[PDB]
Amino acid sequence: SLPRLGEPAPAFEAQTTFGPVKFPDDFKGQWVVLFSHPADFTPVCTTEFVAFAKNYEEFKKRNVQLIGLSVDSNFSHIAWVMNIKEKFGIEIPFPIIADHNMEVAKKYGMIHPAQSTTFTVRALFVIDDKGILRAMIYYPLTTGRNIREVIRLVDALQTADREGVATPADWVPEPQTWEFTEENTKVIVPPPTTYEDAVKRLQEGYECADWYICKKKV
Amino acid sequence: SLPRLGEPAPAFEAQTTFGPVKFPDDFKGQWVVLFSHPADFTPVCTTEFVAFAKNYEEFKKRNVQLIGLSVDSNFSHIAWVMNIKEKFGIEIPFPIIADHNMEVAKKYGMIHPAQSTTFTVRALFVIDDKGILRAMIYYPLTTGRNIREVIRLVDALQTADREGVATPADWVPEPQTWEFTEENTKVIVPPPTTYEDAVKRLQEGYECADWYICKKKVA
Amino acid sequence: SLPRLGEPAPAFEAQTTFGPVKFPDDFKGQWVVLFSHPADFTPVCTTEFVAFAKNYEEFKKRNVQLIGLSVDSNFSHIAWVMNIKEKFGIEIPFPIIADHNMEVAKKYGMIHPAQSTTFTVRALFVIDDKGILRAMIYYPLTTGRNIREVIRLVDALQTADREGVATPADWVPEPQTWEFTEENTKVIVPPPTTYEDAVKRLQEGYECADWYICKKKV
Amino acid sequence: VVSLPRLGEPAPAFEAQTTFGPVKFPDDFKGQWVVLFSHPADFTPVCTTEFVAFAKNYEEFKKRNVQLIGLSVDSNFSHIAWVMNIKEKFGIEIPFPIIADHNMEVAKKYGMIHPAQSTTFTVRALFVIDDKGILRAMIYYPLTTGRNIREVIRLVDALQTADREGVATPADWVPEPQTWEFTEENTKVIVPPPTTYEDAVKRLQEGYECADWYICKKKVA
Amino acid sequence: SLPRLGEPAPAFEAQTTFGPVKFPDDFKGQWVVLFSHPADFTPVCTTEFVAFAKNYEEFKKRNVQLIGLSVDSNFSHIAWVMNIKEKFGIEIPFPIIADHNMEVAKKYGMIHPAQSTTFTVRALFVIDDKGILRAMIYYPLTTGRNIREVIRLVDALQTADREGVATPADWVPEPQTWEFTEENTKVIVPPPTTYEDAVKRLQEGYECADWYICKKKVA
Amino acid sequence: SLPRLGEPAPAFEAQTTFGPVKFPDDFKGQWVVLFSHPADFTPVCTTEFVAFAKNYEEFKKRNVQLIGLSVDSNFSHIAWVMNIKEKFGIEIPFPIIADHNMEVAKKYGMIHPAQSTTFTVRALFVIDDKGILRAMIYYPLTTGRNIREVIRLVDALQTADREGVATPADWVPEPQTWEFTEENTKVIVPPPTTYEDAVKRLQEGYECADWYICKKKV
Amino acid sequence: SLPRLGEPAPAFEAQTTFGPVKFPDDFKGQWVVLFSHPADFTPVCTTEFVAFAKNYEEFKKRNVQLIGLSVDSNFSHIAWVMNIKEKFGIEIPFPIIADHNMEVAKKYGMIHPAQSTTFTVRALFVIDDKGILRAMIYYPLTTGRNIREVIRLVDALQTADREGVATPADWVPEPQTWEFTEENTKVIVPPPTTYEDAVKRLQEGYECADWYICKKKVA
Amino acid sequence: VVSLPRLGEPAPAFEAQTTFGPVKFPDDFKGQWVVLFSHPADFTPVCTTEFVAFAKNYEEFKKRNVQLIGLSVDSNFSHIAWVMNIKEKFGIEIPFPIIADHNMEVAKKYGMIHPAQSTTFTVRALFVIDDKGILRAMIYYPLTTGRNIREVIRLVDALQTADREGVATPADWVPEPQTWEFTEENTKVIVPPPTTYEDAVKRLQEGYECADWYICKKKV
Amino acid sequence: SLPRLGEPAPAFEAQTTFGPVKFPDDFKGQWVVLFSHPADFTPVCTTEFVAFAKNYEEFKKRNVQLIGLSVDSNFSHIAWVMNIKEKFGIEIPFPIIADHNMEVAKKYGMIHPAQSTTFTVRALFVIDDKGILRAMIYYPLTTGRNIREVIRLVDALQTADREGVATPADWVPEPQTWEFTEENTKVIVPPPTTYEDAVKRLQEGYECADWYICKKKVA
């Protein structure tokens, strides 16, 4: 079903890479960006986690707790975070929910069967300091999210609350430039789904940080 | 429910690290050892996978297809197989089922809620070349299995079928000795459950091949 | 149905060769290996009872109470224990439940109708000192169990509880050797099912301790 | 349940394993009279004395075209072991089949389970069935009390004479004058069998006349 | 249904040749042999009543109350006892229940429709001094009972209770001989069912004490 | 329920002292006087059977088939007829139904529970040559019937049919006198209900033809 | 339904030629002969009423209250009693119930539809001094009753109660003779059913006291 | 129920016994007008005066093609006895049939039973039914109150005139000028009839003008 | 359903040409003649209202309150009374109920659908001083009522109550003659049902007091 804007975010308790969480009660007084990703050790997800990690202080100074979610186990989460540290030198600084039985995913409408009957889509929810769902995004499995738009959305909602205003199309709090570089143009090869293919993938001439994350340009 | 001995093993189609499988149709004419493990990147499971892999030729010459299973995705499975290869020098030579939605696990009674509502226990099923369930074991999350007993069980079942006999307690096909060394006495530290604990775990002085698999001896 | 690992072992009261038992109330503070056998006066079962009996001190020193079970009467049980003492020189030192109406067997999933609608399979259950089911095995009618693996399983479970550890594949508490001899290679002739065949069986040239237990090599 | 089998109607049909192989009852014994009887448990003492008495009278039943067949809830392997035991301890080989009614299905069809007697064992039920498979007469004795084998023979004679001659038979009828002798040996009573292994070991040390742990006799002062 | 061994004998109130009875309450403290017979003025029945009457002291010294039962009226019962006294010189010394509407018969499983939808079979029940049903037999309409086996059964049950023992096959309390004479070989002609046949029956060459009880011998 | 005047008499098949009967198939073309009596070997009943037997030719010349009925067996019936022949010198010339299970009695409303739950009352039914119930009487256990009134009733019903007339109160076909003698004033001692009382009854000084039929005067 | 012998007679309240009655409350301590007749102004009924009236003292000396019943109104009843007095010289000395809506008749099973759906049959009930139904008869519309047998029945019932005895077949309290004369042999012509036929009936040469009561003799 | 019979609809059909034989109603009277009326009880006085008045006017109804027919819950044998009584006591022979409706089946169809009047007798109902079997008019008088026979005749004239000429008739309409005379005899009232035989005997000694025990007259 | 003689007349509250009425409570101690008429401005009805009005004193001296009723409105009632006064010189002296929704008409069985589904028939009810319904008549739409018979009926009912007597056929309290003159022989032309027909009716040569009431004589 459809999570409802302006109502308390669906409550849950779950294991995370930071320990157990009571959501959103454990984050009262903080804004929360809750997002989901289909699967540990898949490539778009890795680029999104790295981008969120690189922007962690941008969220922290906005009183935003980032928290990810997939249907993977907490042990797979830790392994993936370890892998990201090994292959990219970046340590994920925010918790990831282990939603094994899809109980949280279903509360948030994150399972779209034509996309996948087993993985979440790329859902993202902005939740305010009172636990109220404020905004949401549902991107498909193919398509990585825009992390700066998440920051802008948080800025827009916090400004609206603080000042009693609305924000127009394309609003930002101060003049700014979003640079997208040559690196932002590289596309992702869909990851291998067999071990034999994963071994072959590393020999196909792509730019691969690991078997599951290979880039090229279009 | 309890899967029933002497009845066809519950049929299923599943995704695996070797591609899709239609069970047991794809394995007619082969014996099958189907076993489950709670989670990729956990230590008892890793020691079991290495032991099965090292014993892969023992099963192959007995016309046994090994097939593992957990509720993890194939992407976790592949990463885990890569990790074991780097840390232990063995390439897992048998498929692992990605039973994402626990549909196969429930058909086999592999989910025991007091053990885990999300992970399978350490279940193992010996299935004959006709797809019939012949024997089964359910060990808990704490306790690694005895791979040589799985081989003995297969031998006993194959000998019973081939010769029209039964096999007594402690039966083996020829005299033999199962040696357990000092290496087999090391116990496993329960794996870390937070990333912070996983980083600290590697600094605690245990015998660790990776953050999730640290061993020690009892004193 | 499937007994549940980690939950209290299904409770029952039963008659045994040692008198009535209330399970698991009578065994609080002791580990219990409850196992079933299809039928008194059948050969695989006899070899297993002898093996358990020979290892009785191994179980006792581990605070384990052994307890057998079949659907036979207590009078059949006593006759069988008397027969084993006479033919093999060993006195069964542990109780056998007479589960005539299959009430306990069904609570433990011991009846697999394609194996037999009248006899239990070779089920075995490890139960801890608080009555919790810890592990279980289901072997078919053809196939005797591995008694040393039952002891190892007990050791691994007790070490796990005592030390707060897990045990790897093929774990033992100290280096050791399980020797299997030429005697362990003899197979069992399926027992006769008519009195005439039982009389003829003793004249067929096998190695027979009694009409129902004849061995040969393959 | 506990339903009474009906006299004059076909004996309740069943298929079962026996010490002689599988039986389809009563179809396999069509054209023969049948004495179907039950006993609570293999390796119990009154039962042994009854099986010995039936075995000793096997030719009396055979000459009357009577198939004896026993029944208990014990397995066929217990049955064979018990027949082996009787042969060794008494020198008598049981010459008729014993049904293994593992799950009490036959016992319930014949009203043989009386819960105040036992919820697990049959009582001492006995059924005379004619050559057309019709139930003709039946007896239900309790666990304590062995049956009278000569009265079973007399009952068969009386029913066969009734059928052959179109007559009824009076009280105490016999086909020819005869004397049923009961000797001093027939006065010995049975000590209730031990029900634990320890008690069975102790029972053999109590000074009785015991052919085996489960069958000890004495006289009543 | 089948009366249950080891349970209280089914209770009832009825008229008898000795007056009204509340069963088994009126005979508590005595053992009871309750038996049924299909019909007054029929021949096997007469021979059984005479045999029980002759053995009345054997039952009395064992604290046993004999009581018969049929679906005939009490007036038919008294008439039949009078007839037995007139024709045989024997006075029936125990009561006969008048179970006019088959209510008691049904409680004891005495009606077997393939035998008769109107008459009881030859049922007999041994009931102890506590009112518990101990043993029972069901003989068909053709076949008279064995009175000495009833006595032996009582002895065996009383000995079991008194001594805490079981009794073997063919047990007796003391050595003894049961003689069956030439007189015991006479068979019974099925009784006539019409008045004309009853008159003719007396001219057919049998040994008839009355129209309904004719004997002969067979080869 | 009350059998209905003017309607076919309830049909039945029954055993009798003359063999099986099918009512009304066997009696088409004959009038039928069906009557019941509570019990063989009881005194009022005996006096009634003797009176009907003595009047048998009166019924026969009127094309009337007499048929009695009680819930007693045919063996009791025959014994009672034999007894009546010996004590009174008359052979019952009409059949007696053995209505063992009260099925006919209930069809005819012959069971009145306050009188007896096991015996019929003194019911009598006149049935014509077409099987139609024409008249009925129900007397209690105490009170013998009037046999000449039964004959008168038949005459009146047959005259009505033959002549197309009705018959007045006290009608007879020709002048006549019903004599009742000193013998008709003797009353009946209620029969003994125990064997002991029956033996004593024969010693009490009444006018007794047998234990069950003793008379006196008032 | 058939009223039950030995049970209280069905209670009712009704209008009669003597005034209202409550049955059996009004007749406690008296015996009651309740009888019904199909219709006022019909001939058998008239002969029965005259016969009962002539025997009124015989009933009174036996503590018996006679009470008749038909479905006719009290006005028809009174007119009929007037007619009987003029034609036969007897005044009906007992009450007649006006059972307009057949409520009493139905309680007593007096309506037999094949006889009449509107008239009672010739039912008669003897009821004792405690209100208990003791005996009953049902004669058809064609056939007048026997009044002396009603008296004999009352005597037999009262003697049974008084003496604790039964009465045999054909019992009377003292020797006596029931005389039936030439007058008792005349039959009744079925009454006319139209006014025109009633006028013609009086001209047909029968022995007629009135249009509805004409007698003749047979052949 | 009970129902009001409905004006303008077929008169409720029935078959019944009458003093003239069986009738199938209103079927046997098709082509004739019918005056069906009920009376509580044979051998009661108001009813007798009404039957005499109808009998005396029988020719007036006959010439208007009207069949008179009475009805009560009394038996046909009571009916015949009552007509015989009227002939003996008054010299008048009832010339029309009387229905014997013992089981009130017809009475119920016509709403003739009013339990507060009587649960056993009909009231004084009267129904005019035309030659097509259609119910045209009805009146219900109580047990106390005899009917007006000339008003029944006038009602018949009015209905037949309406049908024949296609007109309506005003209040108090008659087909030709006429005079209805009521005499001194018409002023005598009726003593309610005795209901016990003893009272019926005593009634004849009370000094009234009694043609019979049930019909005694006096003046007010 | 038929209103019940001998019971309270169905109660109602209604508007009338004299104001609201509570029926029959407002007439306690008075007799009531309640009558209905199909429709204001129709001819038979007019003749009946004039006849009742002319006889109003006859009713008053008998303690009788006349009250009419139709389904027409009170404004149509008042208009019709005005019309009657203008065309006939008579003032209606009793109330007319306006029973617009037929509620009273249905309580009194005044709606006979084959006569009219919208108008009452010519019903009339005599109700005594206790509100008890005593007598009733139902005449059809074609046929005017007889006003003197209504008075005679009241006299007969009041005399019955006062004297404890019944009144015979054709009873009157004193000798008298009801004269019907030539004027009583004129019949009524059925009234026009369209405005056009009403205009044309006045040109047909009849004796018309108004468009709706035209009289003639018939041969």
PDB file of N, CA and C in Angstrom, chain E residues 146-187:
ATOM      1  N   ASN E 146     -22.461 -74.114  28.632  1.00  0.00           N
ATOM      2  CA  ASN E 146     -21.748 -75.101  29.445  1.00  0.00           C
ATOM      3  C   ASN E 146     -21.782 -74.595  30.879  1.00  0.00           C
ATOM      4  N   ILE E 147     -22.635 -75.194  31.715  1.00  0.00           N
ATOM      5  CA  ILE E 147     -22.840 -74.637  33.055  1.00  0.00           C
ATOM      6  C   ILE E 147     -21.582 -74.793  33.918  1.00  0.00           C
ATOM      7  N   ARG E 148     -20.855 -75.897  33.765  1.00  0.00           N
ATOM      8  CA  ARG E 148     -19.658 -76.055  34.582  1.00  0.00           C
ATOM      9  C   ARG E 148     -18.576 -75.038  34.220  1.00  0.00           C
ATOM     10  N   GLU E 149     -18.522 -74.601  32.965  1.00  0.00           N
ATOM     11  CA  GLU E 149     -17.577 -73.540  32.614  1.00  0.00           C
ATOM     12  C   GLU E 149     -17.962 -72.212  33.254  1.00  0.00           C
ATOM     13  N   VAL E 150     -19.260 -71.960  33.440  1.00  0.00           N
ATOM     14  CA  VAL E 150     -19.678 -70.785  34.190  1.00  0.00           C
ATOM     15  C   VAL E 150     -19.176 -70.862  35.622  1.00  0.00           C
ATOM     16  N   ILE E 151     -19.293 -72.034  36.251  1.00  0.00           N
ATOM     17  CA  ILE E 151     -18.816 -72.190  37.622  1.00  0.00           C
ATOM     18  C   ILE E 151     -17.301 -72.019  37.686  1.00  0.00           C
ATOM     19  N   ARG E 152     -16.590 -72.598  36.717  1.00  0.00           N
ATOM     20  CA  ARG E 152     -15.132 -72.498  36.698  1.00  0.00           C
ATOM     21  C   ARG E 152     -14.699 -71.047  36.540  1.00  0.00           C
ATOM     22  N   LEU E 153     -15.391 -70.321  35.665  1.00  0.00           N
ATOM     23  CA  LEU E 153     -15.111 -68.905  35.444  1.00  0.00           C
ATOM     24  C   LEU E 153     -15.272 -68.114  36.729  1.00  0.00           C
ATOM     25  N   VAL E 154     -16.349 -68.379  37.481  1.00  0.00           N
ATOM     26  CA  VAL E 154     -16.550 -67.726  38.779  1.00  0.00           C
ATOM     27  C   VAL E 154     -15.411 -68.058  39.736  1.00  0.00           C
ATOM     28  N   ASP E 155     -15.069 -69.344  39.852  1.00  0.00           N
ATOM     29  CA  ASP E 155     -13.960 -69.738  40.720  1.00  0.00           C
ATOM     30  C   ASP E 155     -12.675 -69.016  40.334  1.00  0.00           C
ATOM     31  N   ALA E 156     -12.382 -68.968  39.036  1.00  0.00           N
ATOM     32  CA  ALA E 156     -11.154 -68.334  38.561  1.00  0.00           C
ATOM     33  C   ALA E 156     -11.138 -66.850  38.895  1.00  0.00           C
ATOM     34  N   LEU E 157     -12.277 -66.174  38.703  1.00  0.00           N
ATOM     35  CA  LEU E 157     -12.336 -64.747  38.986  1.00  0.00           C
ATOM     36  C   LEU E 157     -12.248 -64.502  40.484  1.00  0.00           C
ATOM     37  N   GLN E 158     -12.924 -65.320  41.281  1.00  0.00           N
ATOM     38  CA  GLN E 158     -12.853 -65.111  42.727  1.00  0.00           C
ATOM     39  C   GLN E 158     -11.457 -65.406  43.261  1.00  0.00           C
ATOM     40  N   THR E 159     -10.799 -66.430  42.715  1.00  0.00           N
ATOM     41  CA  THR E 159      -9.432 -66.746  43.129  1.00  0.00           C
ATOM     42  C   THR E 159      -8.472 -65.629  42.744  1.00  0.00           C
ATOM     43  N   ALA E 160      -8.606 -65.113  41.523  1.00  0.00           N
ATOM     44  CA  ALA E 160      -7.778 -63.987  41.097  1.00  0.00           C
ATOM     45  C   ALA E 160      -7.924 -62.814  42.060  1.00  0.00           C
ATOM     46  N   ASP E 161      -9.166 -62.463  42.409  1.00  0.00           N
ATOM     47  CA  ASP E 161      -9.392 -61.376  43.358  1.00  0.00           C
ATOM     48  C   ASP E 161      -8.853 -61.717  44.739  1.00  0.00           C
ATOM     49  N   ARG E 162      -9.128 -62.931  45.226  1.00  0.00           N
ATOM     50  CA  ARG E 162      -8.742 -63.268  46.594  1.00  0.00           C
ATOM     51  C   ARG E 162      -7.229 -63.363  46.743  1.00  0.00           C
ATOM     52  N   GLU E 163      -6.553 -63.955  45.763  1.00  0.00           N
ATOM     53  CA  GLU E 163      -5.138 -64.277  45.907  1.00  0.00           C
ATOM     54  C   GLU E 163      -4.205 -63.321  45.177  1.00  0.00           C
ATOM     55  N   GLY E 164      -4.733 -62.405  44.373  1.00  0.00           N
ATOM     56  CA  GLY E 164      -3.895 -61.521  43.581  1.00  0.00           C
ATOM     57  C   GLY E 164      -3.103 -62.262  42.524  1.00  0.00           C
ATOM     58  N   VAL E 165      -3.745 -63.188  41.827  1.00  0.00           N
ATOM     59  CA  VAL E 165      -3.075 -64.042  40.867  1.00  0.00           C
ATOM     60  C   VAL E 165      -3.859 -64.015  39.579  1.00  0.00           C
ATOM     61  N   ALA E 166      -3.269 -64.606  38.556  1.00  0.00           N
ATOM     62  CA  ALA E 166      -3.986 -64.912  37.335  1.00  0.00           C
ATOM     63  C   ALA E 166      -4.181 -66.419  37.247  1.00  0.00           C
ATOM     64  N   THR E 167      -5.134 -66.840  36.402  1.00  0.00           N
ATOM     65  CA  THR E 167      -5.317 -68.268  36.276  1.00  0.00           C
ATOM     66  C   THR E 167      -5.009 -68.700  34.852  1.00  0.00           C
ATOM     67  N   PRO E 168      -4.278 -69.791  34.687  1.00  0.00           N
ATOM     68  CA  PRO E 168      -3.904 -70.245  33.349  1.00  0.00           C
ATOM     69  C   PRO E 168      -5.076 -70.831  32.596  1.00  0.00           C
ATOM     70  N   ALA E 169      -4.797 -71.149  31.340  1.00  0.00           N
ATOM     71  CA  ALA E 169      -5.724 -71.933  30.552  1.00  0.00           C
ATOM     72  C   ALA E 169      -6.151 -73.168  31.334  1.00  0.00           C
ATOM     73  N   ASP E 170      -7.443 -73.463  31.299  1.00  0.00           N
ATOM     74  CA  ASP E 170      -7.969 -74.714  31.857  1.00  0.00           C
ATOM     75  C   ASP E 170      -7.768 -74.831  33.370  1.00  0.00           C
ATOM     76  N   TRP E 171      -7.662 -73.710  34.079  1.00  0.00           N
ATOM     77  CA  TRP E 171      -7.444 -73.754  35.524  1.00  0.00           C
ATOM     78  C   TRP E 171      -8.676 -74.246  36.274  1.00  0.00           C
ATOM     79  N   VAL E 172      -8.445 -75.037  37.321  1.00  0.00           N
ATOM     80  CA  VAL E 172      -9.482 -75.386  38.294  1.00  0.00           C
ATOM     81  C   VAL E 172      -8.903 -75.235  39.695  1.00  0.00           C
ATOM     82  N   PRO E 173      -9.760 -75.013  40.697  1.00  0.00           N
ATOM     83  CA  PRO E 173      -9.241 -74.844  42.064  1.00  0.00           C
ATOM     84  C   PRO E 173      -8.721 -76.133  42.675  1.00  0.00           C
ATOM     85  N   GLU E 174      -9.242 -77.278  42.256  1.00  0.00           N
ATOM     86  CA  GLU E 174      -8.775 -78.575  42.723  1.00  0.00           C
ATOM     87  C   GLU E 174      -8.952 -79.574  41.591  1.00  0.00           C
ATOM     88  N   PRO E 175      -8.186 -80.667  41.592  1.00  0.00           N
ATOM     89  CA  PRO E 175      -8.343 -81.668  40.532  1.00  0.00           C
ATOM     90  C   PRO E 175      -9.782 -82.152  40.499  1.00  0.00           C
ATOM     91  N   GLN E 176     -10.269 -82.431  39.298  1.00  0.00           N
ATOM     92  CA  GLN E 176     -11.672 -82.775  39.130  1.00  0.00           C
ATOM     93  C   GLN E 176     -11.867 -83.340  37.736  1.00  0.00           C
ATOM     94  N   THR E 177     -13.033 -83.934  37.549  1.00  0.00           N
ATOM     95  CA  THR E 177     -13.409 -84.609  36.325  1.00  0.00           C
ATOM     96  C   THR E 177     -14.804 -84.135  35.959  1.00  0.00           C
ATOM     97  N   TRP E 178     -14.973 -83.624  34.735  1.00  0.00           N
ATOM     98  CA  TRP E 178     -16.298 -83.266  34.215  1.00  0.00           C
ATOM     99  C   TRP E 178     -16.786 -84.392  33.318  1.00  0.00           C
ATOM    100  N   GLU E 179     -17.772 -85.160  33.789  1.00  0.00           N
ATOM    101  CA  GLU E 179     -18.273 -86.271  33.001  1.00  0.00           C
ATOM    102  C   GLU E 179     -19.438 -85.788  32.151  1.00  0.00           C
ATOM    103  N   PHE E 180     -19.414 -86.149  30.873  1.00  0.00           N
ATOM    104  CA  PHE E 180     -20.531 -85.945  29.963  1.00  0.00           C
ATOM    105  C   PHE E 180     -20.991 -87.325  29.518  1.00  0.00           C
ATOM    106  N   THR E 181     -22.273 -87.615  29.718  1.00  0.00           N
ATOM    107  CA  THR E 181     -22.803 -88.959  29.569  1.00  0.00           C
ATOM    108  C   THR E 181     -23.527 -89.119  28.231  1.00  0.00           C
ATOM    109  N   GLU E 182     -24.033 -90.335  27.991  1.00  0.00           N
ATOM    110  CA  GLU E 182     -24.872 -90.575  26.820  1.00  0.00           C
ATOM    111  C   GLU E 182     -26.052 -89.613  26.770  1.00  0.00           C
ATOM    112  N   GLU E 183     -26.610 -89.274  27.939  1.00  0.00           N
ATOM    113  CA  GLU E 183     -27.719 -88.327  28.011  1.00  0.00           C
ATOM    114  C   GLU E 183     -27.336 -86.969  27.443  1.00  0.00           C
ATOM    115  N   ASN E 184     -26.072 -86.581  27.594  1.00  0.00           N
ATOM    116  CA  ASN E 184     -25.598 -85.298  27.091  1.00  0.00           C
ATOM    117  C   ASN E 184     -25.394 -85.281  25.579  1.00  0.00           C
ATOM    118  N   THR E 185     -25.589 -86.394  24.879  1.00  0.00           N
ATOM    119  CA  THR E 185     -25.455 -86.409  23.426  1.00  0.00           C
ATOM    120  C   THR E 185     -26.780 -86.171  22.717  1.00  0.00           C
ATOM    121  N   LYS E 186     -27.889 -86.166  23.441  1.00  0.00           N
ATOM    122  CA  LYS E 186     -29.175 -85.960  22.784  1.00  0.00           C
ATOM    123  C   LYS E 186     -29.256 -84.537  22.262  1.00  0.00           C
ATOM    124  N   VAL E 187     -29.717 -84.395  21.027  1.00  0.00           N
ATOM    125  CA  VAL E 187     -29.916 -83.089  20.431  1.00  0.00           C
ATOM    126  C   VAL E 187     -31.392 -82.722  20.515  1.00  0.00           C
TER     127      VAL E 187
END
